Ligand binder design. Sequence first.
Ligand SMILES: NCCCC(=O)N[C@@H]1Cc2ccccc2[C@@H]1Cc1ccc2c(c1C(=O)O)OCO2
Ligand SMILES: NCCCC(=O)N[C@@H]1Cc2ccccc2[C@@H]1Cc1ccc2c(c1C(=O)O)OCO2
Lengths: 149, 149
Amino acid sequence: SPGIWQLDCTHLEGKVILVAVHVASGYIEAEVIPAETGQETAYFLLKLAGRWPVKTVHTDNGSNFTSTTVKAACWWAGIKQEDGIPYNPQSQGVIESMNKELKKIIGQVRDQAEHLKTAVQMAVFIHNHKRKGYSAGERIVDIIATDIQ
Amino acid sequence: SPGIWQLDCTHLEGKVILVAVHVASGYIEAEVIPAETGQETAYFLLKLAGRWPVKTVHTDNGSNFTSTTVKAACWWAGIKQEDGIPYNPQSQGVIESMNKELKKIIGQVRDQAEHLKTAVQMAVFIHNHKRKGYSAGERIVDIIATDIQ
Ligand SMILES: NCCCC(=O)N[C@@H]1Cc2ccccc2[C@@H]1Cc1ccc2c(c1C(=O)O)OCO2
Ligand SMILES: NCCCC(=O)N[C@@H]1Cc2ccccc2[C@@H]1Cc1ccc2c(c1C(=O)O)OCO2
């Protein structure tokens, strides 16, 4: 559980926002890309796994699950690649809710940035710092620190 | 101390590698950019501060310290921008040593990646996971978790 992440791909302004959510905390990292490809997904996962202890990734769709480039990145980084089938059905809804909420925040900051990528990183910041009490950033650190100990 | 980061800019293959080091742990994040500009530095800091609780940044040079765009990012993200003058002289040497070491790792992985950016992220991964015993990734999580508590 400390090591479980979920990929999520959402669309805005004709572009793609690729998101990794740390399932137990709600903490996210995100990037804007022109389109979701295996190469983009592979690179994003490499970045993520260098920054946090990523043990398992629930991939967002079958194309990324199948991608030989994504499989290579997961092998390289020591990530177990799993499907993202919401056997637990409240998973879909939790992600749909996060996407709506991310887009809401993006809209709230959108006029402060010339470029979408900047607004997305502003939204990541706001999301990870928001107290709900702990923030997602606080929860992920506590979860992993408990695991190490 | 849990919130103190240092910027560092180094050169390879005609490109620039921008690094943020968490001073107390040795943990890093890095990116490849064509050249160090205020805009690139500002965006990098926004990404960093959305991912970790960045309180203070020792900027890498006076151009970034002066940059109105960097100042805007630091204001937005709640970062105190400081100079990077190594009043303590072992700071310079510690960074020089990190740059040499990062470049060493990059050379060790370089043939596994078509693009420099990929090799740099591989190097970030190896650096943050290397046990020295704890790893830098373990130390940063423990430091911040102790601070929260
Ligand atoms: N020399 C052939 C490369 C070997 C190969 O296919 N996999 C690599 C091993 C590996 C391991 C982890 C992550 C990436 C990669 C690499 C793939 C790759 C994917 C995406 C990218 C890339 C490159 C890149 O190659 O830099 O660049 C930006 O987005
Ligand atoms: N409407 C213009 C006002 C913007 C302005 O001056 N500062 C912003 C506030 C702010 C606050 C934090 C980070 C960036 C920014 C922005 C600047 C910026 C810088 C670098 C970038 C950018 C943009 C961008 O604007 O997206 O894009 C990719 O690299």
